[PDB]
Structure 1
Amino acid sequence: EPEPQMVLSPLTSAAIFLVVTIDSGGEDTVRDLLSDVASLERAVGFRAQPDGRLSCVTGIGSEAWDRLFSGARPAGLHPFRELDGPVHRAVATPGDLLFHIRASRLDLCFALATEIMGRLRGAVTPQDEVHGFKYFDERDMLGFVDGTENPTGAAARRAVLVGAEDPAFAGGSYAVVQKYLHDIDAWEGLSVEAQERVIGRRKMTDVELSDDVKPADSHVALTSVTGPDGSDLEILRDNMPFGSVGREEFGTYFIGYARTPEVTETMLERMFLGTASAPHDRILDFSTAVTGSLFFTPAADFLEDL
C-alpha cells in the first residue's frame, strides 16, 4: 500500500506555510532534504508527543517536478491557472516547494521550519512565509466558523488521495494555496444578516441557511459542486488566519487538498468567473488573493526512496 503524507491531520491550532523556489543548481540539495523530511518531522515532534501533533506535508510544483525528477509525472500536475474574472482575479505566483507545517503550538512548527530551511540554505529562495493561528472556536478572520463541512474519515480519504485513476502516484494529493487579505473595514460595515448572506451560514450558531434563503452568490452555494453522476465533489481545507495588527493586515491562508486539481479549480472558476445565477462569490468583495500556487504532495514512500 502507498503510505500518504499527513494530509488528513487531526485539528491543529498553529501552522507555518513556507513556499520557496529552487535556485539554479539547488536540485541536488532539495532531493537530499526531501528524503529526510519525515526523519526531521519525527526528530522535532517525538519529544513533544502526544499533544504536539506536529506534521509536515511537502508539496512539489509542476516546473520544479520536471527539474527534480525524470519519467512519469502526476496526471493533473500543472502550474496554477490564473483566473481573470470581470471583477476579481486569482493571480498565479511562483512556488516550487510547499511545506505545510501544523502542530498544536507555533514553536514546534517553527523548530521544524528552522531544520528544513537550515538544510536548504543556498539552494532555495523564500517566496512566502505565513504563521497561522486558529481562533479558540475555529473562527476565521471574518468571524465565521471555518472547517465545518470538511469531509471526515473515509469520505476525506476518497476526496483527497490519488487512487487507481493515476496508479503510479497513488497516495498523493494536490494542494492549492492562496493567501487572501480581507478588507475588514468593508466587512464590519455589513450587518450580521448581510454577512450571513455572503457566507451562506448563520454567524454565531454555524447552521447552514435554508435552500430558499441561501443566495446563489453566497460562498457555500458557489463551492457546493456535484459531479455528472450526482456525487458531492469535496475538498479538504485547513484555512488559517494570519496577520499584522500594525500593518492592518488581516488574512486567510487558504489551502485545499483534492485527489485531482479539477475539483478545486471548478470551485475557483465558480468563485472568480461565476455562473448563470451568480456574477461571482460575494466573499471576494471582501477578500483579495495575493498568491496562488498548485503543488503535488507525493506519497511519503515516494519521498523516502529518493
Structure 2
Amino acid sequence: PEPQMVLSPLTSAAIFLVVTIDSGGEDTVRDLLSDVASLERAVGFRAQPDGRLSCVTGIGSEAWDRLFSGARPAGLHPFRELDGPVHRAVATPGDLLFHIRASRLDLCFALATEIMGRLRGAVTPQDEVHGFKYFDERDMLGFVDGTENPTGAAARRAVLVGAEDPAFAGGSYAVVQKYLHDIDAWEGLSVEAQERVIGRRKMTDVELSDDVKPADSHVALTSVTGPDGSDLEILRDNMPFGSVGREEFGTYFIGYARTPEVTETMLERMFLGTASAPHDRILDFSTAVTGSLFFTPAADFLEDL
C-alpha cells in the first residue's frame, strides 16, 4: 500500500484548506478524491525537482460515513473537545483537509485553485491558511519549530497505520489546530522565561537539561513514553501565518500519527495537565480557534474510488 506524502521533505510554504461537504456534494467529492494525485502531478511536475509540491487529503469521521460504506479506520472519530480549567481545545467543523506544501506558495495556490474549482457548489470553505517558513525554521514565538520530529524509519513507524488496522494500512491521522498568539504578552517575558515555557534555548535550540526543564514546559508535556518504555512520537509541520494589520500572529499546528491516541494523549497533557503541571505554559500565549481530526488514507485507496 502506497501512503500519501505525509513524510514530505522540508517545505517553506503551505496552504491548509478545510471544507465541509454540502448536502448532495458527496458524488462530486468522490470524483475529485480519485483525481487529486493526477492534479498534484499536473501542477507540480513542471517545477520538479525543487518544487516539492504535495497534497495530503484527509477525511473527517462524519464525512467518511457520508462518502463510504463498509469498514472504517479503527481510530476515526470527531476531534475530542478538551475543557481544561483555564484552556479549551475547541472542535470546529471540517469534512475534508487539503494539506498542500511546496517550496513556493505559487504551486500551493495553483493546486488549491484546481481542487476548489472541481468542488465548487459541493463544499463550503471553513478555513484557509497560507503558511510561511519564518527565518531559520522558527515559529511566531521565535523558537525553532520541528527539531525533535522523527526522521526516516522512526517517522514511518510513528505515522503510518500498519498491521493493527490492516484494511487501512498506509493511512495516517492528522490533527489540525489553528493557534493565535498573544505576542504582546509573550514579548513581555525575558528570553530566559520564554525558554522555561518551551523547554529549549531560544537562540541555539539546545534542550534544557532535565534538572532545569520545567514540568509545565511544552517539551516536558509533549514528551510521552508508552507502557513498554518507547517514545510515542508524532510528525509535525507547524506553519506560521498572520496579518500585521489585524495583529494576527499564528501557528497552524498539524500533527500526524499512526493512531489519534498519541496526539490526543499529548493534547490532554497540554490542556488538562498532569500531577506536576496545571497545563502547558505555551497555552498562556496561544489560543486554539480551530480543532479537527482527519484520516489521510493510503494513496491507492483514493485512486480506486
| TM-score > 0.5, shorter chain as reference | yes
Q: In the TM superposition, what whole-angstrom CA distance separates every residue of 1:208-232 from its partner, at most 9, and x where no partner exists?
A: 0000000000000000000000000
2-structure distance, mates of 1:294, 1:71: 20
In structure 1, what is the Cα distance between the partners aligned to 2:80 and 2:213? Answer: 29
- Cα separation, 1, equivalents of 2:82 and 2:135: 34
CA offsets 1:43-79 (integer angstroms, 9 cap, x no match): 0000001000000000000000000000000000000
Equivalent residues in 2 for 1:1-306, closer than 5 Å: 2-306=1-305
Please state how far the C-alpha of 1:275 moved relative to its aligned partner. Answer: 0.2
Unpaired runs of 5+ residues, structure 2, are: none
Cα root mean square deviation, aligned: 0.2
Partner of 1:71, secondary structure, is coil
Give the distance between the partners of 1:304 and 1:65, measured in 2 at CA. 16
Shift of 1:136: 2.6
- State the SS of the aligned residue for 1:264: helix
Give the CA deviation at 1:172. Answer: 0.1
Percentage of pairs with the same residue: 100
Q: Secondary structure at the match of 1:288?
A: strand
Q: Deviations over 1:74-114 (max 9, x none)?
A: 00000000000000000000000000000000000000000
Deviations along 1:160-210, one digit per CA (max 9) or x if unpaired, are 000000000000000000000000000000000000000000000000000
Question: Structure 1 CA distance, aligned partners of 2:114 and 2:56?
Answer: 15
SS of alignment partner, residue 254 of structure 1: strand
If the length of structure 2 is used for normalisation, what is the TM-score? 1.00
Query: 1:42, 1:49 → 2: CA distance?
Result: 10
Q: Distance in 1 between matches of 2:299 and 2:195?
A: 40
Shift of 1:288: 0.1
How far apart, in 2, do the equivalents of 1:33 and 1:98 lie? 13
1:95-144 deviation line (CA, Å, top 9, x unaligned): 00000000000000000000000000000000000000011300000000
Measure the CA separation in 2 of the matches of 1:120 and 1:86. 40
SS in 1 for 2:43: helix
C-alpha distance in 2 between matches for 1:297 and 1:55: 13
Q: Distance in 1 between matches of 2:134 and 2:62?
A: 36
Structure 2 CA distance, aligned partners of 1:97 and 1:136? 30
**Cα distance in 2 between the residues matched to 1:229 and 1:277:** 22
Q: In 2, Cα distance between the equivalents of 1:136 and 1:248?
A: 19
Q: What SS does structure 1 have at the residue aligned with 2:162?
A: coil
Calculate the TM-score normalised by the size of structure 1: 1.00
**SS of residue in 1 equivalent to 2:251:** strand
> Displacement, 1:40?
0.1
- SS class of match (1:101): strand
> Runs of 4+ in structure 1 displaced over 6 angstroms?
none
Q: Give SS of 1:130's match.
A: strand
- C-alpha distance after superposition, 1:248-294 (max 9, x if no partner): 00000000000000000000000000000000000000000000000
Q: What SS does the aligned partner of 1:112 have?
A: helix
